[PDB]
Amino acid sequence: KAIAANKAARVALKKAAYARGLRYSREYRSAEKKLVHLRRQAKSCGNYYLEAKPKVAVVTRIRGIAKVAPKQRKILQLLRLRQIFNTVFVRLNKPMENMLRAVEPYIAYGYPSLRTVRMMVYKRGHLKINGQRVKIVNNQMIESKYNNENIVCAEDIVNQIYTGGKHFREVTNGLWPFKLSPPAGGMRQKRRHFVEGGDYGNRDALINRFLARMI
């Protein structure tokens, strides 16, 4: 009886995950075509388009845990950047932009592409479950973690940690911070800022490349 009701649910969930990610695919294709029209409108209008600011950065701890000061050392813990190539998505509040500004030599970050978000959540994605670090494998796994009619798909997660979400904290917090491998082909200098020809600090959209070699 329950044995099959587990089927009615597992079938109903992909019916939902299908329905969800069909919307998210449309909500991407549409949102970006709309964001192309405007910047394209404006070029016709001899006119600039102030693109909406990033509302999510994929912060990545990039120096190791030795010799770090008590203020940086706390901010990294609150970012949950406790190891080297840990990663988290943190949305760019002023209060966060002032946390990130406090530990930039310890982190590389930028504004993840939707693809960067997919790869981390699908490949490197791990839910916290009963404190266990649990590899994402089922959408069943996700709906149980997130008791939230909003958050069912792994596509629900990627939208939250990309669109900026109303559950961006509800989602990203239920994820273990990402444990990325060191960037293939290496860094540049974990000591200099990115614009110095180094590695640390905000590197805008370029983080997707750097973070792609890692994932």
């Binding site: 405007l38 404006a42 209008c45 006119n47 600039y48 388009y49 102030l50 693109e51 909406a52 600011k53």
Partner: protein
Amino acid sequence: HSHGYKCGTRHLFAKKFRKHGVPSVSTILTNFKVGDYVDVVADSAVRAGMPHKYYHGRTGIVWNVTPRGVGVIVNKPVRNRTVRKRICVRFEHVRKSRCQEAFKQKQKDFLNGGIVRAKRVEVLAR
């Protein structure tokens, strides 16, 4: 080698320039019910009941009002603990806090980017 009660207060208890003088009537007519937040900003013109020094500028709640004095509970970090101090204070040395004025305003009220059509636009070169 010489830490008496007012060591190193040459600047701390100084009156501001052209702002010397004993506290006015607005001071004297302020009133402190217990549990009020306050600022123990010591005023040099009044010497009786002056706060130590650590307590200068500290905020705390009144726990006590005597006729000329406001008892104030002010946390002090002693070591691994914040001991919770009870300075006694003449009311001149206590400026009532606005530390919660925002939050009281809240429960008072509880009761992207687009095309920029701008046309002036100088070149930025040196």
